[PDB]
Design a protein around this ligand. Structure first.
Ligand SMILES: [Mg+2]
Ligand SMILES: [Mg+2]
Ligand SMILES: [Mg+2]
Ligand SMILES: [Mg+2]
Ligand SMILES: [Mg+2]
Ligand SMILES: [Mg+2]
Lengths: 138, 176, 196, 190
RNA sequence: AAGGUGGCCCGGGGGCCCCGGGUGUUACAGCCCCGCCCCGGCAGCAGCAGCUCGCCGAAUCCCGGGGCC
RNA sequence: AACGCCGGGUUAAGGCGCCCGAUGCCGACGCUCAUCAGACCCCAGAAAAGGUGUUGGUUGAUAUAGACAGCAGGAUGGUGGCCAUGGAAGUCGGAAUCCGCUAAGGAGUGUGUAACAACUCACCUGCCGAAUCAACUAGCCCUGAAAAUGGAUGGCGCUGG
RNA sequence: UUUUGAUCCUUCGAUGUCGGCUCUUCCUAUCAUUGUGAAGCAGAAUUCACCAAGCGUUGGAUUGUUCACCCACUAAUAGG
């Protein structure tokens, strides 16, 4: 039950390769397994790129199938995609992933202490709730 | 000739050297697809040898240059004419591929001829390469792509980085 | 070649249609060509008859729509077994002649029935033969001294019924169609004017 | 080659009320229900439109082998509609030369005893499939009538009785005995 | 000129708006080619918009890390 | 590729699922399903001829001014065509093979006929609406392919290899 | 490769050389049986072909004979 379709104008997130972590629009189709791609505002050159590597989102900035890079830059700024991106939850769990790699040892210790406490509180409240449901039953 | 990596296109010209009979022989140009100027010069000599009274020793090569793609970001539909040797017999072809560059296309031809006919690279001679317009394109695999509102999904998505866990709990999904 | 004969059809269709502006869209349904030659022999000089490929008429008429709009109403009319009957001489006499002229051909064991088909009571015209074809159905047939005689009259086929071979055989023997193969009128057309 | 796309629509009438859990289809109406699993086939079955007037069935990136599975579905669904609305009457006449075949029905048209076939002492206790109603017609001497919704089950049970009454070691071109299917039709016409 | 954008006509989906189909040449979307404006003019340049395509260093040098003796 | 006894580095021909050191590359493009599949010089075994299995090619006809199936209806007129002959009246031989309505109708595919009858054929109207048809060629697979202790792509096994 | 021939790599300080008897297992290119297709197959009888080798395939006169020929029963008196 397909929801996202490869349509000229659709935005894709680059999984791996040289241009990792970058957003980019599908300009055109060559064949079954190879497409013309360009992302002017994110510092990615006009180039070929196979569908294998990419994984498409639910945004479709509108432009003609052969439109030269000018009209794309204007349409991109016009829609203001980058901000809606940063609003998406996706990017947030990406930044979390990265902060977790960046995790310092001192922060790691402060975090362990925070966990320890937050979980003792939860344990207390949950046990009172279970006795409460028994009280409700009784 | 092994077609390693991806070909270039080279503009070779050459001639027979002067003689007392004829002081200024005519120049001859070709369009060699080849990885480098060394194998280019060799193949040039083979074709000239097939057509004209001319060897490498009796002559000299005047100029070998690389020739760039003058329109590399436009997409094109190339039309190739062939000449191949079967196990038994020889046969002419006309084949249409859909690529951006002459070199990328010629590569794709080599790989297709290899798949579909087990034709080894040495047997094959390239005789004409013409960029051809969508109107004049005959083959339906090409013809189907000329449509403004092309649309298709990615249905079954085989996983890559299979071994990076090698051992998980959750069975992997492939539907998004 | 077929491409040039079609363009030739376009060469007939444009000259007669531009010069003559008046057609009787009659329908030559299952009529034979020998019967057609007798009707053409009747309307040889005065009338000019036409059939053809439906799309051949579609584009010849779409070409006509730029110059003469009179054939705009013809596009839907060439449907069913339909053909044009161009005519200059007179309209009512050719309409009555075209509706009349039908040669009674053999009865078809298979086509649909518009109305009831009938089988009158009449002798077979043979010696001692197999009575099972008539007595299978339900018709009184007696052996009037050797020769078979029919007692009672019964109507076999009703409105909209497939004509079997057995029920077909007596019409094939008589060679007398209840309704003749023919040419059915659709609409009259006089210089951009429809007649029902 | 890999054909980018094929599809084919079936415009259904308003009487029927289909629904689907993915591939498994369910169809209800007057005569009853009909489920049918397609999990082996791998296609997109979109049920679009108000008044449920049409089914559409996509098939992305198919080769010659995979294109054949579209129209086969279209037809299986259409026959399913016939089975729910109208049903299926399979007629079949008992042909014989000399020895008459004494037929009798057991279990309200579920089972069929067939005696005195070629004067054989063996007797053929043929069992019909579930959801099938055997019945001897009236106003006809040699006439079975098999009624039901599913054409598959009906027709298989027909062939069961047909191949059950088969002449072994004999010239079949001459000995033209046994039951044979004559007229396939429906219970109520349309 | 067209892999046809707005306009026009037909449908099909809603009660002015959305989706298919048909002509057609810029109109509130574009593409293609020739000529003339100091190779039209401006940075930058085999481009850290860290991989659009190469061959090289008397036209090239520096720093760091591991192993063995 | 040629050797005195050793430490370190790098290579050749071969290879990199596990046995068995090495890809646990996010490697690139394609073909193929086998109720006897296939797997690397010398090598330890198989062919001519087929295939509406399938993938490509060539040539020649057909196509939007719109076929080819399909269902139906006609499915035939000069005419018993002349020469042969005995008769070719559509259906040994042999000469014939032009015309008509035309949407199309042969001096005729079969059953059945010395030729008609009866059933039946090429050819076209009705609806139908885009691509269709014929002959060749080479690629993989299959058929063609039978022997004796229980048995061998090196084994295990392998079908997004 | 169950005939026959062509060859000489192995063994001549020795591999016991023809037939019959007895006994096991094995191959299938199916003689018969089981199931089925095709016949110039009406039934009977008889021919051709597919799956299939699990179970059967004799008693005697003459000849050292293997082989050959014959009498008698049989469902069958197939081959290695
Ligand atoms: Mg190894
Ligand atoms: Mg020796
Ligand atoms: Mg010894
Ligand atoms: Mg000894
Ligand atoms: Mg065998
Ligand atoms: Mg018998």
């Amino acid at each position: 039950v397909f929801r996202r379709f490869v349509e000229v104008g659709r935005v894709a997130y680059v999984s791996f390769g040289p241009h990792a972590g970058k957003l980019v629009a599908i300009v055109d189709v060559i064949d079954q397994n190879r497409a013309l791609v360009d992302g002017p505002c994110t510092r990615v050159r006009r180039q070929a790129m196979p569908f294998k590597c990419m994984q498409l989102t639910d945004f479709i900035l509108k432009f003609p199938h052969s439109a030269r890079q000018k009209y794309v830059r204007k349409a991109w700024e016009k829609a203001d995609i980058n901000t809606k991106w940063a609003a998406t939850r996706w990017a947030k769990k990406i930044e979390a992933r990265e902060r977790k790699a960046k995790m310092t040892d001192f922060d790691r210790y402060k975090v362990m202490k925070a966990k320890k406490m937050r979980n003792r509180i939860i344990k207390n409240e949950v046990k009172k709730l279970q006795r409460a449901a028994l009280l409700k039953a009784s | 000739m092994k077609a390693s990596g991806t070909l270039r296109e080279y503009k070779v010209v050459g001639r027979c050297l002067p003689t007392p009979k004829c002081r200024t022989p005519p120049l001859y140009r070709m369009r060699i697809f080849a990885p480098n100027h060394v194998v280019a010069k060799s193949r040039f000599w083979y074709f000239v040898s097939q057509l004209k009274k001319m060897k490498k020793s009796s002559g000299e090569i005047v100029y070998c240059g690389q020739v760039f793609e003058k329109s590399p970001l436009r997409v094109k539909n190339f039309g190739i004419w062939l000449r191949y040797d079967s196990r038994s017999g020889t046969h002419n072809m006309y084949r249409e591929y859909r690529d951006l560059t002459t070199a990328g296309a010629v590569t794709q031809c080599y790989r297709d001829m290899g798949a579909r006919h087990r034709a080894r690279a040495h047997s094959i001679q390239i005789m004409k390469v013409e960029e051809i317009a969508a109107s004049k394109c005959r083959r339906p695999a090409v013809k189907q792509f000329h449509d403004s509102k092309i649309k298709f999904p990615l249905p079954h998505r085989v996983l890559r980085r299979q071994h990076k866990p090698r051992f998980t709990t959750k069975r992997p999904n492939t539907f998004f | 070649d077929r491409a040039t004969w079609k363009s030739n059809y376009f060469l007939k269709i444009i000259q007669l249609l531009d010069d003559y502006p008046k057609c009787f869209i009659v329908g030559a349904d299952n009529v034979g060509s020998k019967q057609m030659q007798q009707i053409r022999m009747s309307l040889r000089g005065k009338a000019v008859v036409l059939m053809g490929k439906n799309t051949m008429m579609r584009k010849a008429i779409r070409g006509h729509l730029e110059n003469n709009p009179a054939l705009e109403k013809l596009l839907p009319h060439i449907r069913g077994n339909v053909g044009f009957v161009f005519t200059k001489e007179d309209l009512t006499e050719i309409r009555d002649m075209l509706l009349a002229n039908k040669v009674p051909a053999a009865a078809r064991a298979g086509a649909i029935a518009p109305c009831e088909v009938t089988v009158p009571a009449q002798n077979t015209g043979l010696g001692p033969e197999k009575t099972s074809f008539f007595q299978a159905l339900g018709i009184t047939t007696k052996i009037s001294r050797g020769t078979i005689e029919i007692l009672s009259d019964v109507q076999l086929i009703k409105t909209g019924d497939k004509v079997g071979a057995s029920e077909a055989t007596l019409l094939n023997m008589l060679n007398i169609s209840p309704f003749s193969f023919g040419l059915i009128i659709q609409q009259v057309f006089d210089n951009g004017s429809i007649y029902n | 080659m890999k054909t980018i796309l094929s599809n084919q629509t079936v415009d259904i009438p308003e009487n029927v009320d289909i629904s689907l859990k993915g591939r498994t289809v369910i169809v209800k109406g007057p005569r009853g229900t009909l489920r049918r699993d397609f999990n082996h086939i791998n296609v997109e079955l979109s049920l679009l439109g108000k008044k449920k007037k049409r089914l559409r069935v996509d098939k992305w990136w198919g080769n010659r082998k995979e294109l054949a599975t579209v129209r086969t579905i279209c037809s299986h669904v259409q026959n399913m509609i016939k089975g729910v609305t109208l049903g299926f009457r399979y007629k079949m006449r008992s042909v014989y030369a000399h020895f008459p075949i004494n037929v009798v029905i057991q279990e309200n048209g579920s089972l069929v005893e067939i005696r005195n076939f070629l004067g054989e002492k063996y007797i053929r206790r043929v069992r019909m499939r579930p959801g099938v109603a055997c019945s001897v017609s009236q106003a006809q001497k040699d006439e079975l009538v098999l009624e039901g919704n599913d054409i598959e089950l009906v027709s298989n049970s027909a062939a069961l009785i047909q191949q059950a009454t088969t002449v072994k070691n004999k010239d079949i071109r001459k000995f033209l005995d046994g039951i044979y299917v004559s007229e396939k039709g429906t219970v109520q016409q349309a």
